[PDB]
Each structure stands twice: as C-alpha cells, then as structure tokens.
C-alpha cells in the first residue's frame, strides 16, 4: 500500500511516495538519490519524533488514511554537520491573504 509524503528541510520540499511496508532507511535512500547525502547523515522526523531506520513507514504512523496523494504526510529532515547534527528546521509556507468579503458566509 502506497503512502504519499512531503520530505521537508529548510526551504526544500520533496514530493515522493513509498510502500507502507517500506522502512525509514529505505526512505532515506530516496532522499539520498535526490539530495545527494547518504542515510547515515540524515535524521527523519515525524513531527518532533525521531524515526528509527528499522521501523516501517506504517509503524511510524504513515498510513493510507494519513499520507494521501491530495493530502500528504510531512516528514522532517535534518543533515549531519561536522561532528554534530543540525537541528530540525522547516521554514513554513507563505500565508494566504485575508478571506475577501464576497467569500464569507
């Protein structure tokens, strides 16, 4: 069963899919192919929870009812930097303008 995700770091968002039985490490391989950094230099987060490389995407909470094509689940990404790691930082999207009057009830 497929789950649809948004891998997000800083001002970068990756739209990808994976099997629900796919593991977090395998998802790191997908990130490695795109952003050219290996899994050992990655930390994937669901909200603010660190995900083990051994758990499947379903065991982390990414099911077909939470990771849908029209509403993908968000996975955080942090890269290794020198002897330490950088903190998780996802810069938010822009904000929509105030709802115009003709659209209000």
């Amino acid at each position: 069963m497929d789950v649809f995700l948004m891998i997000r770091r800083h001002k970068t968002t990756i739209f990808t899919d994976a099997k629900e039985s796919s593991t977090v490490f395998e998802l790191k391989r997908i990130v490695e192919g795109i952003l050219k950094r290996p899994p050992d230099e990655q930390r994937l987060y669901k909200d603010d929870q660190l995900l083990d490389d051994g758990k499947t995407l379903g065991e982390c909470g990414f099911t077909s009812q939470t990771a849908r094509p029209q509403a993908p689940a968000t996975v955080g990404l942090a890269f290794r930097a020198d002897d330490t790691f950088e903190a998780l930082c996802i810069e938010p999207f822009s904000s929509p303008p105030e709802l115009p009057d003709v659209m209000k009830p």
């Binding site: 497929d2 649809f4 948004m6 001002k11 970068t12 968002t13 990756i14 739209f15 990808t16 899919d17 795109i34 849908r68 094509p69 029209q70 509403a71 993908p72 810069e91 999207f93 822009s94 904000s95 929509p96 303008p97 709802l99 115009p100 659209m103």
Partner: protein, 89 residues
Amino acid sequence: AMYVKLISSDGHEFIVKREHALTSGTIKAMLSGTNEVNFREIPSHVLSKVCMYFTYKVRYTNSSTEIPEFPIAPEIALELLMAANFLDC
C-alpha cells in the same frame, strides 16, 4: 524517476517527479525551452497545493478506485484558481 525543482516566489524549492510536473502544459513548455522552473508570482502556499494536485491526478487518472475529493480551503481557492489558469492543469 527524474525529478524537477519548482521554485515558488518566496524561495521555496519543491522537488517533484518530472512526469508529475508535466501535468501542466506551461511547465512542460518552460522545461522544453534546465531541470528547474522559477515561478515569480506563485507563493509557496499555492505552489505546494499545485504539487499536491500533480501527485493526485497521476494516482487517480485512469484508475478504477473510488476517487476522493481534492480539497481546497477558502483562503487558498482564489489564488489556486489563478495559478491553475496560468499553468493549464
């Protein structure tokens, strides 16, 4: 497969599959005229929703599954309408 980078007007980089981005005829023309497209007047909160529509159309087109609704909040509907008219999708 191959990926392309769609850059919003506020600097957000969206990395989608090239097949999915080619849903828009405008993006297919911008790419064919290298693997990046800069949208000078599409904000990130709109371009993100457009990318979600690409992964939504490719999954459910020609599929016999029960298709769910593509949701559009009222605060984004007017800008998403303008973006879709420009991108032709």
